[PDB]
Design a protein around this nucleic acid. Structure first.
Ligand SMILES: [K+]
Ligand SMILES: [K+]
Ligand SMILES: [K+]
Ligand SMILES: [K+]
Ligand SMILES: [K+]
Ligand SMILES: [K+]
Ligand SMILES: [Mg+2]
Ligand SMILES: [Mg+2]
Ligand SMILES: [Mg+2]
Ligand SMILES: [Mg+2]
Ligand SMILES: [Mg+2]
Ligand SMILES: [Mg+2]
Ligand SMILES: [Mg+2]
Ligand SMILES: [Mg+2]
Ligand SMILES: [Mg+2]
Ligand code: NA
Ligand code: NA
Ligand code: NA
Ligand code: NA
Ligand code: NA
Ligand code: NA
Ligand code: NA
Lengths: 122, 211, 222, 88, 71, 33, 85, 104, 129
RNA sequence: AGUGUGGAGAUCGAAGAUGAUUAGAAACCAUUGUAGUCCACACUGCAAACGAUGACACCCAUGAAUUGGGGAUACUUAGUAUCUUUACGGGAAUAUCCUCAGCACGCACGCGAAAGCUUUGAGGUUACAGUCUCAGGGGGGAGUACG
RNA sequence: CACCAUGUUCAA
């Protein structure tokens, strides 16, 4: 039974959030960083935090981890989603021809505006 | 709500608006009918899928827009979503219209727990689906908050006041209904003109895989 | 010493809402008991302890005893409030139930029996209020009648501001938790009955959180 | 003109409650489900003006699931929504 | 449930007459079995002659001896 | 256990005990008659 | 927004669905037809829900068959629905 | 005391029928009504996987092309016999209402 | 079977008002039913109502506003004198300020306020408020 | 279940018998077994004879089904197929929509002490009145005694 | 699926 209690897990999640650039994939160099960026009465807890910070870093290299918020990663990935195609997708469907079923065309014919130009049956 | 006091036809659905609705399949139901949404259904296709009236969809869409545009101070109109398919839509809608939003799990007590430190008191609530956003609608029933909801053919209409009959399942359909709603609210203000088409693309309203 | 956590409480402290009737008109819930402290004139609001009794939960080692306290608040001028709370201590339960009494404050409609002379003295119509099996029926009475009610309903009807009434009770009236709430529910029903006096159409009004929306934004902002 | 009055003419009522616009139901002070929806008035062009038209719905109508149908009836009555499309 | 006819007074009179006998207080005051069994014969007080003294053990949970006499 | 507290023996067996008591009472009156 | 139902003036769709007694005003469900003898070409008026087997007056030929509902007309006959009124 | 089941434990509504003839329980023979009894239709292999392999190895007719026969029994149980044999268990009050219309 | 037609009609109207309906169909109809409805109409408790002829006991469609709390029939008719008007408002009416007791009198079907002014007793038909 | 008279008597089986178990155990278990169980005629009229819910009538929100009979293939009217087919056969069953009648399921008001009921009310009730009828009045004694 | 009966009177 070697579960990291919530005190170790919360503190190791705080360290990764604040010192992600300084951390690494090894326990011993990370434990050195934990030694001076943390205040704790116990060396054992600092040892368990260093073990779980390294576990978080190995998890972060494979993908995003719930409970960790890194602003540099978030903004960089947000800019990726902000990019738009040269032409709109709804336009491309219209220029390619909108296909409707029988019931939809009956409703369109009953409309005051009539059937739109680039709309055909299926 | 296309009818105005002067009798002008300015808010009525044009041919461009109908094309956008038809391309994104916003008129497609769920084959499962509901008593509250029976009126909004024009008919049933041969394969069983229900077809949403487009006049009734547009009348309800403008009514919601005129209600949202009537809120002098934004950010007390909350746009909630739980499907994760409308999470980017409500984020983009809030970017232009200027409203509050919350995607993902609705934390219970957000509208009722006054000491939560994450406690908000909106004036209007907008949700993507009454069934999946039942938590937000339930709290709004305790604090006098009207609800505007994008409702499908099988939606339950308890505690929702303005129901937009729409296809709130597909990625492209949800993006268009929030794009059309955002465009109309901006048009109802002085932000953009009706003649010039909107420069913002509906693709920014679509949901993207996190990968 | 009061930092409002709600838009209504912020408006009350900023003196933008000055009466309980604006809250009553727009059906807004009251989440802070300090809203009633401001909006009721000093010395008008009175409190009284109706009932205190212990409730027990059987546990593995003996049992646990807590105390349920009933408080009645009211200005004797058309406002009544009933609130019940449980605490591990009698004093703690008493304090919590005074807060709950102010939070559950309702308006009471007072009318006439015969001629509409002077201030209203009785309820406008027959009303009943039910809690559990207990139902309390209040009947309008002529002037000079007084409150013909049991001592527990009589105290609530005195705090509500009615002078003459005929009261009948049914069920287990010795269950004073239900008897206190049954009287309170009957008085709440007075403003839900549509009388030909209220048939006329009234013009729309602006919600206080709508009218002062720009003021409330800058409070949270700064 | 609305409320309980005296023989001297004074208004006896403490306050005049709102009435639901669909059921003519007095909206009580402690129901907390009744809403007030204000629809913006639009000028000849697409831009709104300062005026709005507000509807009051009792909280029991929303719990039944009939507040959507009631608002449809009211907005058509007040000339806000169009009941059907015109002739092509 | 009961009858509600305009000319149904005979049924309502018999209903109360038959069902009043289920009232133990009413039946006791309208029958002679209570007075015939009552030693005092329907009177408040009555004189007597003492026969013997008896001590009655009080019912539980009480434990005592109550002084009593046969009269 | 399908029933509530009887406060006595089983009602079916009390009914049978009463049933036999009536039989022996009508036999004692028969022999005197 | 759609059209609200009117109790005194029901629409065609709802009135057509209704049972003849459940209708707003009670009315019959049957009619009369002009059926011609297959071997005679002589026309007789036949009830739509006839339960007695109708014979051609000259032919003496069965023109219909009883059923639990509408009468089944003979093969080779021609019929036209007579106006109700 | 209180009504435990709206079903009353049987598949007999109030105005459906009066009497349903009882069956003998599969295990102990207790006479229980046919709609109340806990009925299970089982299809059992005559031999287990290892025993079938040995017998089918010695069988000219049985193998991959021709399957071995099975046992088909409709078993109806008394309520006491079904609970003890664990073909059916007591359930939480909320979970009591869920029914399965097909073998799962 | 149906024994009182007015009692059935008033239960149908009262049920529709509690349910918030704008219209109600009444079947069957009589002269007493129509005369009762006209008394409520002249006091503003119901809107326009329409009688449909079906060559039988007709049907009535009543347009309902939200002003009617409860209407009902008192059975049996319970003949009422001019001195019993006060005792009937004390029993069945919510207040002395509003609500009407409808009686059938030799001068016609009218509410208790009109009947008292005409100085006529009658048989109590019902109430509405 | 029981009774009478004739049958019948395979299985099961009150009473009874034997063997176990047990401190005891003509109890549960085992092997048997009489009356019964089955039939005809005649009695009896005692059930958790239950939905522990009297009968008749009105109104009453929703979705998926089910059994029988039919019909169709504040708007002036809104489709649809599948399989078998030399004689209880101008057939049978399906699909879609509607409708009357029946047994119901998951259910919006409302009701209820609650459990729960809910067009199948236990709803439309202190805002108490559609009609008729039966029963109840703290627990026992006692459904006993007498007639 | 061998056998497994009981707990003096009031009051914490
Ligand atoms: K149950
Ligand atoms: K049947
Ligand atoms: K039975
Ligand atoms: K045997
Ligand atoms: K007897
Ligand atoms: K002993
Ligand atoms: Mg048990
Ligand atoms: Mg039990
Ligand atoms: Mg009992
Ligand atoms: Mg025999
Ligand atoms: Mg044996
Ligand atoms: Mg019996
Ligand atoms: Mg019974
Ligand atoms: Mg009564
Ligand atoms: Mg008794
Ligand atoms: Na003692
Ligand atoms: Na003693
Ligand atoms: Na069962
Ligand atoms: Na033993
Ligand atoms: Na039963
Ligand atoms: Na059938
Ligand atoms: Na003692």
């Amino acid at each position: 039974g070697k579960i990291r209690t919530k005190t170790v897990k919360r503190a190791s999640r705080q360290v990764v959030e604040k010192y992600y650039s300084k951390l690494n994939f090894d326990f011993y160099q990370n434990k050195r960083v934990i030694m001076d960026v943390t205040i704790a009465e116990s060396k054992k807890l600092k040892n368990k935090i260093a073990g779980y910070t390294t576990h978080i870093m190995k998890r972060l290299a494979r993908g995003p981890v719930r409970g960790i918020s890194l602003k540099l990663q978030e903004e960089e990935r947000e800019r990726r989603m902000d990019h738009a195609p040269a032409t709109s997708d709804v336009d491309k469907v219209i220029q390619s021809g909108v296909s409707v079923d029988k019931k939809t065309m009956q409703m369109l014919q009953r409309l005051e505006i009539g059937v739109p130009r680039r709309v055909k049956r299926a | 709500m296309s009818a105005v006091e002067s009798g002008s036809k300015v808010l009525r659905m044009k041919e461009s608006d109908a094309q956008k609705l038809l391309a994104m399949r916003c008129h497609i139901g769920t084959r499962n009918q509901s008593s509250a949404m029976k009126k909004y259904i024009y008919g049933r296709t041969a394969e069983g899928s229900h077809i949403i009236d487009v006049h009734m969809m547009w009348e309800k869409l403008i009514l919601a827009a005129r209600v949202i545009a009537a809120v002098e101070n934004p950010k007390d109109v909350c746009v909630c979503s739980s499907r994760l398919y409308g999470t980017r839509a409500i984020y983009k809608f809030s970017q232009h219209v200027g409203t509050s939003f919350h995607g993902g799990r609705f934390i219970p007590g957000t509208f009722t727990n006054q000491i939560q430190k994450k406690f908000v008191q909106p004036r209007v609530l907008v949700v993507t689906d009454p069934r999946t956003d039942h938590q937000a609608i339930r709290e709004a029933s305790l604090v006098n908050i009207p609800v505007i909801a994008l409702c499908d053919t099988d939606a339950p209409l308890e505690y929702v006041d303005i129901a937009i009959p729409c296809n709130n399942r597909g990625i492209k359909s949800i993006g268009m209904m929030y794009w059309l709603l955002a465009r109309e609210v901006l048009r109802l203000r002085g932000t953009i003109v009706r003649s010039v088409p909107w420069e913002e693309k509906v693709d920014l309203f679509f949901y993207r895989d996190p990968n | 010493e009061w930092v409002p956590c709600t838009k209504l409480g912020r408006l009350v402290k900023a003196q933008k809402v000055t009466s309980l009737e604006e809250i009553f008109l727009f059906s807004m819930p009251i989440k802070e008991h300090q809203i009633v402290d401001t909006l009721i004139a000093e010395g008008q609001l009175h409190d009284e302890m109706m009932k205190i009794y212990p409730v027990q939960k059987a546990t593995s080692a003996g049992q646990r005893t807590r105390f349920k306290a009933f408080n009645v608040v009211g200005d004797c001028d058309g406002h009544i409030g009933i609130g019940a709370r449980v605490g591990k201590e009698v004093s703690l339960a008493i304090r919590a139930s005074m807060i709950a009494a102010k939070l559950n404050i309702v308006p009471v409609r007072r009318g006439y029996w015969g001629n509409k002379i002077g201030e209203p003295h009785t309820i406008p119509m027959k009303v009943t209020g039910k809690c559990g099996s207990v139902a309390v029926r209040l009947v309008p009475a002529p002037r000079g009648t007084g409150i013909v009610a049991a001592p527990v309903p009589k105290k609530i009807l005195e705090f509500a501001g009615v002078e003459d009434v005929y009261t009948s009770s049914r069920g287990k009236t010795r269950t004073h938790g239900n008897l206190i709430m049954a009287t309170f529910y009957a008085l709440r029903k007075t403003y839900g009955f549509l009388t030909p006096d209220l048939w006329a159409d009234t013009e729309p009004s602006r919600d206080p959180t709508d009218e002062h929306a720009e003021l409330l934004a800058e409070m949270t902002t700064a | 003109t609305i409320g309980m009055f005296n023989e001297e003419g004074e208004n006896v009522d403490l306050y005049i409650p709102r009435k639901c616009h669909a059921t003519t139901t007095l909206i009580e002070a402690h129901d907390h489900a009744a809403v007030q929806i204000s629809i913006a008035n639009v000028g000849p062009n697409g831009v709104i003006n300062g005026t709005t038209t507000t509807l009051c719905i009792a909280g029991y109508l929303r719990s039944q699931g009939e507040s959507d149908h009631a608002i449809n009836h009211i907005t058509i009555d007040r000339g806000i929504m169009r009941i059907k499309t015109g002739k092509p | 449930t009961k009858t509600n006819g305009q000319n149904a007074a005979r049924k309502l009179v018999r209903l109360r007459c038959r069902n009043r006998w289920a009232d133990k207080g009413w039946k006791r005051a309208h029958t002679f079995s209570a007075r015939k069994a009552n030693p005092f014969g329907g009177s408040s007080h009555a004189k007597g002659i003492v026969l013997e003294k008896i001590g009655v053990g009080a019912k539980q949970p009480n434990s005592a001896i109550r002084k009593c006499v046969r009269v | 256990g399908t029933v509530s507290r009887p406060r006595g023996m089983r009602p079916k067996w009390h009914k049978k005990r009463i049933k036999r008591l009536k039989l022996r009472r009508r036999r004692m009156r028969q022999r005197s008659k | 927004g759609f059209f609200d139902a009117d109790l005194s003036y029901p629409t065609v769709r709802t009135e057509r669905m209704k049972h003849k007694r459940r209708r707003l005003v009670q009315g019959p469900n049957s009619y009369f037809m002009d059926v011609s003898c297959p071997r005679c070409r002589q026309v007789t008026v036949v009830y739509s829900h006839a339960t007695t087997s109708v014979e051609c007056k000259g032919c003496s030929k069965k023109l219909c068959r009883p059923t639990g509902g509408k009468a089944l007309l003979v093969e080779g006959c021609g019929y036209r629905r007579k106006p109700d009124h | 005391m209180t009504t435990k089941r709206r079903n009353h434990g049987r598949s007999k509504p109030a105005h459906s029928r009066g009497r349903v003839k009882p069956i003998h329980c599969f295990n102990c023979g207790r006479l229980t009504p046919k709609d109340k009894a806990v009925g299970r239709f089982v299809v059992r292999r005559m031999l287990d996987a290892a025993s079938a392999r040995d017998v089918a190895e010695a069988s000219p007719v049985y193998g991959a092309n021709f399957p071995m026969p099975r046992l088909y029994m409709k078993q109806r149980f008394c309520i006491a016999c079904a609970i003890h044999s664990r073909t059916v268990r007591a359930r939480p009050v909320g979970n009591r209402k869920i029914r399965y219309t097909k073998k799962v | 079977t149906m024994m009182s037609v007015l009692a059935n009609a008033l239960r149908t109207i009262a049920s529709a008002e509690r349910r918030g309906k704008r219209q109600v169909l009444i079947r069957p109809s009589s002269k007493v039913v129509v005369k009762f409805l006209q008394v409520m109409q002249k006091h503003g408790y119901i809107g326009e109502f329409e009688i449909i002829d079906d060559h039988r006991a007709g049907k009535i469609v009543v347009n309902l506003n939200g002003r009617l709390n409860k209407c009902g029939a008192i059975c049996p008719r319970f003949d009422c004198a001019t001195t019993d008007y006060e005792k009937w408002m004390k029993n069945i009416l919510p207040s002395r300020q509003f609500g009407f007791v409808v009686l059938t009198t030799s001068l016609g079907i009218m509410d208790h306020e009109e009947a008292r002014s005409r100085n006529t007793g009658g048989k109590v038909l019902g109430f509405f408020y």
